[PDB]
Design a protein around this ligand. Sequence first.
Ligand SMILES: Nc1ncnc2c1ncn2[C@@H]1O[C@H](COP(=O)(O)OP(=O)(O)O)[C@@H](O)[C@H]1O
Ligand SMILES: Nc1ncnc2c1ncn2[C@@H]1O[C@H](COP(=O)(O)OP(=O)(O)O)[C@@H](O)[C@H]1O
Ligand code: BEF
Ligand code: BEF
Ligand SMILES: [Mg+2]
Ligand SMILES: [Mg+2]
Lengths: 417, 417
Amino acid sequence: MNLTELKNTPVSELITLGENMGLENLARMRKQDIIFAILKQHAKSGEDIFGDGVLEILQDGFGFLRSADSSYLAGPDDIYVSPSQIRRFNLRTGDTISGKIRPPKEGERYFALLKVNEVNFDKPENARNKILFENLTPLHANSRLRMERGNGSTEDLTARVLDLASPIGRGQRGLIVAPPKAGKTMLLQNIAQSIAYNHPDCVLMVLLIDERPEEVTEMQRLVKGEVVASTFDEPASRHVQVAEMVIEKAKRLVEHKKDVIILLDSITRLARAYNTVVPASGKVLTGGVDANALHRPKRFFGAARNVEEGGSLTIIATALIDTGSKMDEVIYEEFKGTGNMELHLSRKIAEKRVFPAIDYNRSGTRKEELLTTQEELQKMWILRKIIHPMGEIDAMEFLINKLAMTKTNDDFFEMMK
Amino acid sequence: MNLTELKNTPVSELITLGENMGLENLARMRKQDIIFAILKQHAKSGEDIFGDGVLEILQDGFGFLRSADSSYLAGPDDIYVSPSQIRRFNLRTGDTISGKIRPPKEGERYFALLKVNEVNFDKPENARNKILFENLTPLHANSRLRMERGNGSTEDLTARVLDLASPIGRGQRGLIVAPPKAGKTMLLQNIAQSIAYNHPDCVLMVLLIDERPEEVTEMQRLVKGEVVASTFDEPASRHVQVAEMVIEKAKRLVEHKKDVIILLDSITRLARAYNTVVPASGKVLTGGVDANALHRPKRFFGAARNVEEGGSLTIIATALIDTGSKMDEVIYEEFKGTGNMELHLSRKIAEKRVFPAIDYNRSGTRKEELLTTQEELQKMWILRKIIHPMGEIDAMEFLINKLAMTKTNDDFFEMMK
RNA sequence: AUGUUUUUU
Ligand SMILES: Nc1ncnc2c1ncn2[C@@H]1O[C@H](COP(=O)(O)OP(=O)(O)O)[C@@H](O)[C@H]1O
Ligand SMILES: Nc1ncnc2c1ncn2[C@@H]1O[C@H](COP(=O)(O)OP(=O)(O)O)[C@@H](O)[C@H]1O
Ligand code: BEF
Ligand code: BEF
Ligand SMILES: [Mg+2]
Ligand SMILES: [Mg+2]
């Protein structure tokens, strides 16, 4: 008796099971209400019920166990967590809790937690003694997260160009700067697919705030990982809540020496949401940005770091420029002094239908010698010195024509000499 | 005895009928008052009266049935809908209701609804069980909505250029960016005529907010569809109300697997209206735009989506640029990074009296391979690569001179090779 | 109202 197991079951089988259990007509009923009635009827027989979810401690002291399939939205099937157990096990926002639950009695509206069985997918004896995320020693990117497929596919050209322009390692904090209508969607899809193919052990999390739902359901059915999104039909409060829950879960996972990867596509939208939810202080800067509005996105971005004791946190955010709004322009570069990695995309190259439209000149990675060998770094330096004199479109055409001849970049580097 | 039937009748016949029924002199009376008196006299004999309209639920709990011929304006002949029936049939704003009505008794001012016969042009048993619009899975444009006439007319050149620049499919969410005095009116007229000619099965709705009455009555007598407009003589409150009613009706139609097409021509004017009706919060951004003013137009724009279960919602809005106001430059923009189709028009080409004055270079459609075949996409790519080096005016002249030689674009593509 | 917008290189 698990909550996620009943959530994955279809509607027809749940209706059939409820009709066999002998309850009210479930055809004219919601799936969540059907599951609730089935759990009630199964607990009336004396059997136990189990559930799971991410903890969201409220300001009063209690909390609930949000579900991932609903993008951490307030649902009727949330498991109530008393503050006594929180104080007894030192629980915090983001801790994954899995234990026995019971249906609400007369006068209650949510399931109660009796005994916790597993904390953060581990024993509670290992979670009671742990080092906080704020005390971990940061470090630079040491492990190399190669994005090249290696299967010789035609779509691998984007990953090869990305590796030649800006290699990505564990704990990297980069930025994907690109004007609208440049190809950010396809680039993010390719990055997510390459991460899921090359490094399936890492925890991939794609955050899409204030996006077109069709794109949400497309990304959810395309990438092999977790997708937490919030369409534009929701207020900025839900955006802030989702961002906080995601970053808290990422911190709790990193605290257990896990490799978390966050592919953010709405850093600008997140900053707009934070500027909308912040109370007015009577002081407005140039472009309509509050003085204390960028602090929360600043911390959300800076949360990414590489841990020496174990694990890492990678955050790749895509910033929006040339959107016609001065607020986004002020945000983007305020954040430019940030992202230890900038991958610029050119609109002029995208208009020529030359995919990918990557600005190789302005791209780059700091401390790239820690992720590449000596000969590889020398070859990349020679390639950059050869590409720099040529124009952007000409350099992109040259790179595409030279990478189409071979499958691996090593052969291209060997033929360049 | 139908309301719309009496509304379509002329004034002279209604006056004659009222004089034959033996009532007060109807020559010095309004047509609506004449219809009201005729309905009263016909109901005094014991016969039944029927009406219809779009439901507009008020904040208190009751509602009225607005009429389409009055642009959903508050009229004396609105049918009152009690909240009891709303609670009994789960009615919402936008549901088309058609049932028996009765004249108001002593102390009443509006017609009452006794029994509902048809809901959303369908049986109530099919409307009681339905999936909300917020739960439908979005998708990209799959079905091709070809705009080419095919009759070899001289006006078909605009549709041919539009198809070669940006093909339109079901569920598309585009933008027509053009400075003033460019030819937006003729272009919108041609688009509406091509939609009514090629795809007469789709529900066409043209929304004109804050425009001149002459243009309104011109569009109403030119296109073959529904025209809901609101001239500048009305406050922004009526603009917001009309936009809400139109989008709610569109959502209710899409919920019944219908293909709705909305040709918006005032996205900038709608954003200005929303910025005017929003209460001041003491925080003004660059250009005079409120922080929470663009949220409602953002949702109105993002409502457009393609449904996998059935139906679609297409919204083609025309944004205004270079109007001398910085608010529109932020308002029209901020919207640039939202849609997935931009059809730019050049003022320099319009000054040369070269119609249509379309910027073929900056135009385009994302995921265009889902609406065109392989050979068609290759021919469009070759045409774009040939047109790109030439200047805007030169490319437009070349395209016009090459399309004037033949009737179909297939012959042009075959002759280009 | 100052900042924002005006405003840019
Ligand atoms: N690698 C690519 N190959 C082919 N087309 C692409 C590629 N990247 C982008 N595009 C085209 O650009 C359009 C928009 O790209 P997108 O990633 O949505 O840009 P952004 O996210 O910056 O708005 C897509 O619909 C696609 O047709
Ligand atoms: N396809 C066309 N053919 C001929 N003249 C046109 C065409 N499109 C626009 N025009 C001219 O431009 C004028 C204004 O066009 P309009 O569509 O009103 O531009 P906008 O809507 O951008 O203000 C029209 O009065 C018309 O004379
Ligand atoms: F319009 Be893109 F997604 F920035
Ligand atoms: F003056 Be146009 F209608 F934009
Ligand atoms: Mg995008
Ligand atoms: Mg116009």
